């Protein structure tokens, strides 16, 4: 008597939800993305596979914004990630409408958490095929979160998911020990470029494109902002400088 | 008590010859004894060689025109870019106006 | 209003109904049949608001006819008049109430007795030897109090109506263009062809 993996909300005999574990496989299959928490903000970076010369550069934007202060990035099924953000965007607007103040990051994290958890309670819905790294700056500092298909989320110093999660975490844990008194917003951006290049060894057959964003109290006034032109080129050159 | 209607004045005219038609209207828009605008166009080319004007309450006029223009647009999408004949437009406008028989558009309309 | 009269005699119910349909300053019709047959032995007359009047009658008629087909049986006049009352009693507390006053004239084939029921738009039923709706009653009720006997023949009952119609024609302000008269007995419903000059 089996078939415990055919329906979503069902508990297997050992106590698991196999349909969520199958969603995790869809995430591991996806492009690698990371988050670094610094001394006054958060930095997000993501890999973008260039299948053909035909894809217009800088145009297929993956990192998304909720409100004006939160940034979101995800690995796995992109449409699912987009759907999750549409929910977050509605959720934050609703919060701002009633309490005037923009949503705190811990508050926003649970809003995603309860919503993703909800999609593991019924057989008529499919679990989310994404892990989401997200954060920002609120009333009491920077926050970084990672949300799994089960609905599990925690606060992170550094987060990684997708194809090259192994290389990323190994490099993130070295930063926590080498920089015990925090890392600066500028530094974290440059360092985020390196991690993405090092995690690209896992997908080294194809060419890729770098996309970075940051939210910082001193460098961006606590608002989410993309990295462009001279700052992005600086990060690209730094990653190239530490590869040889 | 809130009155949903107002009066923006103006006047429009429509004459048809043998191979032509004209539709005219003053450009003055008013509220009570004040002039809102000295140049506020009130006669519109709706496409398919139809000119339209709705006169009276300007907010109901603009709504009607806007709704009919959108009607022309969808007619092309639905009926293989078929030209909307003036008689068809007329019957279509009747249904727009009568569809608000119990909260009317305070306009006199001419095409 | 319209004239709506009924009288139960020994072995029949007689219904007399106004023939005129007046709207505004014009008498639009002088031959209007203000009655419906509900079943072979039950007849209903009606008066009231312009539209409600025919719509209610025809609606009641469809329901009684539906009952007859389903059951292969005819409801007693008592049962029909209870159904009518409850529809009006329902309608008076709705958004737009039927403004219709009716008379049910029926011959109960089981009991071998004629029956007359007066029911107003509120759903106020009562069984009577004689009845009237509208202003008509203000003249005919006292007239019948005097002249009516409970064992009168159908022929005596028609004479007694003529006396009511003569009084209404003399004293009532409106020209109601005479009446259509119907008999309900053991043999069903029939119309008295000549009453206008009987």
């Amino acid at each position: 008597g089996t078939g415990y993996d055919l329906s979503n909300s069902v508990f297997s005999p050992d106590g698991r939800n196999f349909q969520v574990e199958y969603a995790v496989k869809a995430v591991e299959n996806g492009t690698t993305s990371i988050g670094i928490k610094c001394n006054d903000g958060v930095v997000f970076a993501v890999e973008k596979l260039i299948t053909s010369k035909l894809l217009v550069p800088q145009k297929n934007v993956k990192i998304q914004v909720v409100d004006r202060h939160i940034g979101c990035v995800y690995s796995g099924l992109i449409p699912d990630g987009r759907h999750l953000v549409n929910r977050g965007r509605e959720e934050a607007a609703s919060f701002k409408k009633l309490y005037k103040t923009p949503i705190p990051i811990p508050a926003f994290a649970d809003r995603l958490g309860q919503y993703v958890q909800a999609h593991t309670l019924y057989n008529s819905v499919r679990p989310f095929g994404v892990s989401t790294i997200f954060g920002g700056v609120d009333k009491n500092g920077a926050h970084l979160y990672m949300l799994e298909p089960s609905g599990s989320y925690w606060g992170y110093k550094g987060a990684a998911t997708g194809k090259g999660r192994q290389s990323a975490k190994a490099e993130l844990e070295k930063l926590v020990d080498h920089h015990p008194e925090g890392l600066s917003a500028r530094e974290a951006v440059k360092q985020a470029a390196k991690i993405i290049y090092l995690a690209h060894e896992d997908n080294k057959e194809k060419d890729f494109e770098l996309e970075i964003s940051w939210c910082s109290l001193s460098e961006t006034n606590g608002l989410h902002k993309f990295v462009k032109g001279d700052l992005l080129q600086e990060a690209i050159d730094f990653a190239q400088k530490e590869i040889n | 008590q809130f009155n949903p209607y107002g009066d923006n004045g103006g006047t429009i005219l429509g004459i048809a010859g043998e191979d032509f038609a004209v539709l005219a209207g003053d450009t003055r828009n008013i509220t009570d004894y004040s002039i809102n605008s000295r140049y506020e166009p009130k006669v519109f080319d709706c496409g398919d060689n139809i000119v339209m004007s709705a006169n009276g309450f300007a907010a109901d006029g603009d709504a009607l025109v806007k709704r009919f223009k959108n009607s022309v647009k969808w007619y092309h999408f639905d009926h293989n870019d078929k030209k909307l004949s003036i008689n068809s437009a007329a019957r279509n406008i009747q249904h727009l106006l009568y569809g608000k028989r119990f909260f009317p558009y305070y306009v006199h309309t001419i095409i | 209003m319209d004239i709506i009269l009924g009288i139960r005699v020994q072995d029949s119910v007689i219904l007399a109904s106004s023939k005129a349909v007046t709207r505004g300053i014009s008498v639009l019709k002088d031959s209007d049949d203000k009655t419906r047959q509900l079943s072979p032995h039950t007849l209903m007359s009606f008066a009231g608001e312009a539209g409600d009047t025919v719509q209610f009658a025809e609606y009641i008629q469809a329901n009684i006819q539906l009952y007859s087909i389903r059951e292969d049986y005819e409801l007693s006049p008592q049962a029909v008049s209870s159904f009518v009352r409850q529809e009006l009693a329902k309608s008076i507390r709705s958004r737009r109430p039927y403004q219709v006053n009716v008379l049910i004239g029926g011959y109960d084939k089981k009991k071998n007795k004629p029956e007359l029921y007066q029911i107003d738009y509120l759903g106020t039923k009562v069984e009577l030897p004689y009845g009237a709706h509208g202003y008509s009653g203000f003249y005919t009720f006292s007239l019948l109090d005097h002249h009516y006997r409970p064992d009168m023949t159908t022929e005596e009952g028609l004479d007694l109506l003529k006396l009511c119609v003569q009084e209404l024609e003399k004293r009532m302000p409106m020209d109601f263009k005479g009446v259509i008269v119907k008999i309900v007995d053991k043999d069903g419903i029939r119309q008295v062809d000549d009453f206008q000059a009987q």
Binding site: L6, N123, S124 | - | E71, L75, S76, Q78, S82, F83, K110
Partner: protein
């Protein structure tokens, strides 16, 4: 989704039978036998209680014979809980009819309606049918004494004598053998008890195992009277017939 767990209660077999209606009829073939016999001067209803104990209170007990109207009564075969659901709607229906026409409901009209409710659970809704068969005993001024039967399919028929529940096949032949059209009620009482006594799966037929009722016109009153026999009354009539 839920498609996996749907029994499909309202579908035809390749043979053209309704699976659930069939299995419901099988369920009823296990229920205590009930008998109804219509005579010229009244109707009898006899029923056999199932799995009785000496500690079971009979005085307060009423499991097979129910009063629907002041003039209509029923014998039940099958699930008592299912039957009570229907019995209540039937009681409401008779009262609606009375409030509408100022006349007691004709027996057939009450039967057609219950039978219509049962037919519903057969054709739509995806719910299980009612596991009940009824005998109806009634009187009205149109047909006089009437006897009807209805089963889970919503089919109803009219009878001079009928049995429901267990051993109907055996019970019907015994009735067909001993029933004559010009029967007095006191004779119909005997036939009902004799038939039960023969088809019983118990050792002997006793008062504590029986429910008994009559519908008879007043021996002096001139109108219709129901009588649901009390334990002591049955014990009396069981000595009369010759069963003790």
């Amino acid at each position: 989704g839920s498609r996996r767990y749907d029994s499909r209660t309202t579908i035809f077999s390749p043979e053209g039978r309704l699976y659930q209606v069939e299995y419901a009829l099988e369920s009823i073939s296990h229920a205590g036998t009930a008998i109804g016999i219509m005579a010229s001067d009244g109707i009898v209803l006899a029923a056999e209680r199932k799995v009785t104990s000496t500690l079971l209170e009979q005085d307060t007990s009423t499991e097979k014979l129910y009063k629907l109207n002041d003039k209509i009564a029923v014998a039940v075969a099958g699930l008592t809980a299912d039957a009570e659901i229907l019995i209540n709607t039937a009681r409401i229906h008779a009262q609606n009819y009375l409030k509408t026409y100022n006349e007691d409901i004709p027996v057939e009209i009450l039967v057609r309606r219950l039978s219509d409710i049962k037919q519903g659970y057969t054709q739509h809704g995806g719910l299980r049918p009612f596991g009940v068969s009824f005998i109806y005993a009634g009187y009205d001024d149109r047909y006089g004494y009437q006897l009807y039967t209805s089963n889970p399919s919503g089919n109803y028929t009219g009878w001079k004598a009928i049995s429901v529940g267990a051993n109907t096949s055996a019970a019907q032949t015994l009735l067909q053998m001993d029933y004559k059209d010009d029967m007095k009620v006191d004779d119909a009482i005997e036939l009902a008890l004799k038939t039960l006594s023969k088809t019983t799966d118990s050792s002997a037929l006793t008062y504590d195992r029986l429910e008994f009722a009559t519908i008879r016109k007043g021996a002096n009153d001139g109108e219709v009277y129901q009588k649901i026999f009390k334990p002591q009354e049955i014990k009396d009539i069981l000595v009369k017939t010759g069963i003790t």
